[PDB]
């Protein structure tokens, strides 16, 4: 284990070694450890503590080997790659003859743990058994995640993990320490059961045993009220509900409405979010969304029956949620608050959709539209990426570490990315990988650690902003249909125009990277497209295109002209946006000089490019034709016809048009 830990630090004392030597030694060590793990199920020890310590050690070694391989995807994790690969191939798809020899040790450990008597004396043996159980659970979780990754469709270890959960359901009864690890394991088994109906877990647990486990876990760390075990139990509940589990989900939501069910306590925690830790609030909201999207008829019903306590708190949170919270007291809480707001917006949108389906969304929407201030402040605007400090950190790290790059610490998506200081950069490993030489520690808590933490916090904030973007997009899309009548038109149009302007400005300002986050191209264009669509259908625009079209023109000019490139959806959505914009302008002079740019430089260039490529094309040409038709209808053109005759005749479009007509 110490040899593997030392080899894990491949960023450095080492005179007389090489990558091949370390790789071969690690492979031999892994083979020896696997042989020991397979043979331990036959030895006869004088006592159980010796075998327990041996199992703990081998399981910890295997876990450290597995996590180190998938924690990163760069070359730093190549020294132990043949070893991790071997252990995974031998613990995920072993031969059918020696399949049980590798699983019986874990079963025996679980049995010994679930039938060890409680004793106040001998704390050493107690702590050793606890650490052994936690190591076995972590190893099971690592194996489940490894199987989920790499595309494994048939996992023979799941059949044994089900019957192991059959015991892990009772194991916590002997020690409360096992409540969090066990739940984590279960969550990972459920996740592997999702991306793979699955084997009914009620058949392995049992009615009485399952009800007892539910009654034991429903109270989230009630006697103490910690945050770690709370987020753990909320992620466990969300994962159990998201999967095809239906009996357990029903028994956990109903409680046998809900009077002693998890939701009865989740509402008690939601009604105090103003003072509750933001860290746990994110997990509570995630559980709420997981229970709503899959079991809406119950959660939404209970929330409407008790909306007097939830809607008021939501409005309070929305009104007193500043947009720019970085400048004020608090830097890491910004991402947490953004995630909480995104989840709240998603829940509001889902309940509004349900009410509209029930035709009871008028008053609720009218009362909620007055709480969108935080959205108008920090919604579609994703310009809080601050690429400046990210680039500075990248340059400072590349100047001091020529061999190791900043992108080498990117996670391999092995574990669900935390919305904390380790969203993208693996800090848990970096702390032990770069802390060997001076520079990581730093004086006065400075150096590269603080900068990496700030970068991770900024990335988490950007992710929360994207989530809020999607939530508010859905909310406003449904509200545009909801608020069809002629009322509250002023504030509604103001909000829509502000959203469109923020989107068009972000499309021009500095963009985020494409390898970390998803490409925004075509993701936020259809939003403004449908917004202007519905606003034109309602015909409630202030004909203020004099400034709104400038951003669209700048975008069309600085887009590299990918008329027929891979970015075809982006070009098409930009064309539809400019079409609806110029149509709104037509409904309204200082407009002609501002709209002749599209008639002179945009339409002609795109038409010529399409005519040259066509020698996909039909719809693009039809869209360009519609654009030109709707643009030639602006009142400012009926007098500038003289001025535009020359620009329209300079490109000789009629020749190519007649040619394509032939």
């Amino acid at each position: 284990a110490a040899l593997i830990d030392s080899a894990a630090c491949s960023a450095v004392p080492w005179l007389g070694t090489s990558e091949k030597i370390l790789s071969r030694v690690a492979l031999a060590i892994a083979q020896a450890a696997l042989d020991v793990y397979e043979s331990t199920t036959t030895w006869r020890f004088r006592s159980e503590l010796d075998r327990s310590i041996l199992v703990r050690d081998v399981v910890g070694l295997m876990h450290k080997l597995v996590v180190h391989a998938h924690t990163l995807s760069s070359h730093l994790t190549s020294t132990l790659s043949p070893a991790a690969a071997h252990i995974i191939s031998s613990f995920l798809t072993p031969p059918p003859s020696a399949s049980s020899l590798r699983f019986q040790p874990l079963l025996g450990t679980l049995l010994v743990a679930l039938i060890t008597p409680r004793a106040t004396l001998y704390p050493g043996q107690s702590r050793i058994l606890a650490e052994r159980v936690t190591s076995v659970l972590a190893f099971c979780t690592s194996l489940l995640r490894a199987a989920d990754f790499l595309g494994q469709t048939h996992i023979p270890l799941q059949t044994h993990l089900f019957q192991s959960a059959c015991l892990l359901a009772r194991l916590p009864a002997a020690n409360a320490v096992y409540r969090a690890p066990v739940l984590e394991l279960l969550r990972a088994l459920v996740e592997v059961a999702g991306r793979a109906e699955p084997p009914s877990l009620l058949g392995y647990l049992g009615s009485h045993a399952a009800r007892s486990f539910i009654s034991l876990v429903e109270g989230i760390d009630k006697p103490f009220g910690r945050v770690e075990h709370a987020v753990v139990t909320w992620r466990f509940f969300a994962a159990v509900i998201r999967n095809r589990q239906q009996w357990m989900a029903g028994c956990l939501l109903t409680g046998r409405v809900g009077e002693g069910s998890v939701l009865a306590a989740a509402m008690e925690r939601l009604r105090e979010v103003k003072s509750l830790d933001v860290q746990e609030a994110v997990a509570v909201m995630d559980f709420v969304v997981s229970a709503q999207n899959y079991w809406p008829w119950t959660i939404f019903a209970v929330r409407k029956e008790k909306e007097v306590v939830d809607a008021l708190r939501g409005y309070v949170r929305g009104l007193k949620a500043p947009g720019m919270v970085m400048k004020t007291d608090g830097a890491a809480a910004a991402a947490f608050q953004a995630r909480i707001a995104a989840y709240v917006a998603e829940t509001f949108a889902m309940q509004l959709y349900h009410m509209r389906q029930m035709r009871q969304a008028e008053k609720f929407a009218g009362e909620l539209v007055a709480d969108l201030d935080y959205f108008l402040r920090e919604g579609v605007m994703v310009w809080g990426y601050n690429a400046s400090l990210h680039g500075n950190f990248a340059r400072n790290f590349a100047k001091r570490f020529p061999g190791v790059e900043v992108d080498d610490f990117k996670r391999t998506m092995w574990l669900p990315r935390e919305l904390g200081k380790g969203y993208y950069y693996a800090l848990e490993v970096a702390e032990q990988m770069l802390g060997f030489d001076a520079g990581w520690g730093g004086v006065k808590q400075s150096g590269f650690r603080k900068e990496m933490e700030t970068a991770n916090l900024n990335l988490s904030l950007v992710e929360a902003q994207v989530s809020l973007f999607h939530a508010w997009e859905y909310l406003l899309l449904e509200l545009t249909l909801s608020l069809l009548p002629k009322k509250e038109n002023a504030a509604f149009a103001r909000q829509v125009l502000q959203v469109v302007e923020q989107c068009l400005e972000a499309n021009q300002r500095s963009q985020p990277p494409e390898n970390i986050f998803v490409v925004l191209g075509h993701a936020r264009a259809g939003l403004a497209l449908t917004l202007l669509q519905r606003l034109a259908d309602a015909n409630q625009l202030p004909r203020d295109v004099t400034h709104l079209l400038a951003l669209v023109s700048s975008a069309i000019h600085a887009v590299e002209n990918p008329f027929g490139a891979n970015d075809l959806p982006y070009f098409r959505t930009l064309l539809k946006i400019l079409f609806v914009v110029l149509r709104a302008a037509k409904q309204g002079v200082a407009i002609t000089q501002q709209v002749l740019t599209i008639l002179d430089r945009v339409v002609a260039r795109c038409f010529r490019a399409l005519a040259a490529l066509v020698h996909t094309a039909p719809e693009d040409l039809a869209l360009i034709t519609a654009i030109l038709q709707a643009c030639l209808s602006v009142p400012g053109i009926e007098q500038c016809q003289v001025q535009v005759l020359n620009i329209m005749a300079a490109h000789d479009v009629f020749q190519v048009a007649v040619a394509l007509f032939s």
């Binding site: 049995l111 044994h160 019957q163 916590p172 045993a209 034991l216 910690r226 770690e228």
Partner: protein
């Protein structure tokens, strides 16, 4: 103005589940694991910071002393309550506990029914699944396994419910004892460099319960030193219940399993009381304890045969060995062989407290108790007997040079002219190195390694009495391999190589080690001789260097000694 609101919340919260009462099991677990979050939790913080819990933990006897709280019980049970009240009344009628304690235990059992059900034997389908997984590993009991239906129908019965209630009562007693023991340990031997919240909570609890303020140049140990008799008196009721089960309890429940559970619970309670007493005693190491308490304690041990009557069974060896070790530890502690010899040779009054040396009755009682223990043929009395023999061997010579109160003792039992009995006792104890072997076993069961029965600090503070005994006994019996191996097994305990860490702990825990380099008796006799006998006698010097390098990693004042 000390109510049981935080201690015993309203029954409506316990039933509805809005507030789970902080049972002693959770407190004991949090104090044993030393978890930061749980110890700093608001609920447990308010529970421990309350003066009611302080008064209860300072007077455990009152927690179960038979009283008439019918009015309080009726007021609490008024404003599934009928069954709870019936079970509480039945338990209060069976056991001598008060009605409030019975109601609290019943409520805790009700809240912990999930665990009590999950710790039961598994069903038939589970055994079938386990057999399918297995394709050694025969820790099942299929001959008695039954389905889940018949397991649940029997769980809701009356006899089984009462048995579970009694088991939960015993478990809660053990949990309360362990929790108060760990709390005293953490409050007296708090480790340095801990979180600010832990230090603040410790200071608050101290200032509220015992007025022990660290900013005072002389804290008030009175309320902390008065915790020894509080448990030495409760050990009486513990052994009484161990030697006789409740009479009012139904005969149907008095089965072999119930008797074994009661005996184990009584042994655990006695061990925890002895540990709390040893802690409260070592809190004041140099000064003597009140002889009025040691007199009664030695009379108690004389009567009970050092708990050998309840520990005589062969099914409580795992709990008897540590019990005997802790009894020997507390006996050697209250004996203070080091301070006793210092007083006998210096004749200067300590002024901390009057010792039993000025009372001939206490000496006679101790002598007759040791004689009865040695005549009964018990091994637990080997170190205590040997120590007492040494003390008498020093009193004889003290009388020869003066040929004052101790003279009364020396002439009462005809111990002046002849010195045959104590000499024969010491001979028997040293024959075959039985005393050294039992001391090594006790140190193993009272050490810091994973094989130890108590926490690391508990064993670190318990080895002090054995180290002092070897110190004062080293210059008497000559240097020999047996005492050396004994001291090695004590100081090292037989731990592994990976049991060494640089975790900085309280100086008290390092005392047992640094004493080897502090006192000249343990420096010029063991360390110097061990160094001189090298590489000829390799194991002693090697183990000494190993333990020193493992213990003085953070001690910068003695980091370059090895």
């Amino acid at each position: 103005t000390l109510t049981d609101r935080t201690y015993l919340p309203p029954l409506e919260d316990c039933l509805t589940g809005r507030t789970v009462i902080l049972s002693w099991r959770l407190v004991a677990s949090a104090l044993e694991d030393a978890d930061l979050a749980r110890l700093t939790s608001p609920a447990l913080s308010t529970f421990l910071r309350d003066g009611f819990v302080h008064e209860l933990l300072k007077h455990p006897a009152r927690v179960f002393e038979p009283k008439d709280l019918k009015q309080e019980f009726e007021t609490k049970t008024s404003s599934g309550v009928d069954t709870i009240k019936k079970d509480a009344l039945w338990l209060a009628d069976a056991v001598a506990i008060n009605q409030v304690a019975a109601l609290r235990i019943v409520l805790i059992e009700y809240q912990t029914r999930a665990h009590s059900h999950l710790v039961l034997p598994l069903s038939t389908q589970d055994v079938a699944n386990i057999q399918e997984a297995a394709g050694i590993l025969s820790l099942l009991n299929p001959a008695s396994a039954v389905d889940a239906e018949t397991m649940w129908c029997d769980f809701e019965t009356e006899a089984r419910r009462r048995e579970r209630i009694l088991a939960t009562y015993l478990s809660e007693r053990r949990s309360f004892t362990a929790a108060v023991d760990a709390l005293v340990t953490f409050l007296l031997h708090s480790a340095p460099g801990q979180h600010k919240d832990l230090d603040s909570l410790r200071r608050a609890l101290l200032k509220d319960a015992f007025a022990f303020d660290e900013d005072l140049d002389v804290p008030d140990r009175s309320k902390l030193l008065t915790m020894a008799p509080t448990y030495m008196n409760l050990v009486e009721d513990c052994i009484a219940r161990a030697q006789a089960l409740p009479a009012k309890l139904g005969e149907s429940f008095k089965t072999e399993a119930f008797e074994l559970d009661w005996l184990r619970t009584a042994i655990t309670e006695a061990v925890h009381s002895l540990s709390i007493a040893f802690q409260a005693l070592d809190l004041d190491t140099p000064y003597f304890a009140p002889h009025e308490l040691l007199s009664e304690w030695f009379e108690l041990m004389n009567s009970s045969l050092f708990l050998e009557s309840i520990l005589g069974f062969e099914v409580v060896a795992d709990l008897a060995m540590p019990a005997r070790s802790l009894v020997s530890a507390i006996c050697l502690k209250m004996l203070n062989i080091d301070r006793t010899i210092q007083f006998l040779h210096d004749f200067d009054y300590p002024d901390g407290e009057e010792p039993y040396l000025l009372s001939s009755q206490t000496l006679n009682k101790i002598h007759t108790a040791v004689t009865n223990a040695v005549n009964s043929g018990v091994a637990a009395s080997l170190p205590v007997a040997f120590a007492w023999s040494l003390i008498v061997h020093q009193m004889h010579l003290g009388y020869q040079e003066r040929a004052s109160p101790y003279d009364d003792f020396l002439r009462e039992q005809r111990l002046d002219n002849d010195i045959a009995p104590v000499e024969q006792i010491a001979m028997l104890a040293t024959s075959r190195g039985q005393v050294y072997q039992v001391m090594s076993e006790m140190a193993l069961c009272l050490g810091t390694t994973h094989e130890a029965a108590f926490r690391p600090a508990v064993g670190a503070r318990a080895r002090l009495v054995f180290q002092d005994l070897l110190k004062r006994a080293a210059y008497l019996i000559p240097y020999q391999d047996e005492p050396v191996f004994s001291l090695l097994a004590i100081l090292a305990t037989g731990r592994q190589y990976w049991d060494v860490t640089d975790a900085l702990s309280a100086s008290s825990l390092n005392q047992v080690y640094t004493d080897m380099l502090d006192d000249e008796t343990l420096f010029t006799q063991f360390t110097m001789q061990a160094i001189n006998r090298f590489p000829y006698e390799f194991n002693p010097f090697s183990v000494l260097c190993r333990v020193l390098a493992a213990a003085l990693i953070t001690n910068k004042d003695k980091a370059d000694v090895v």
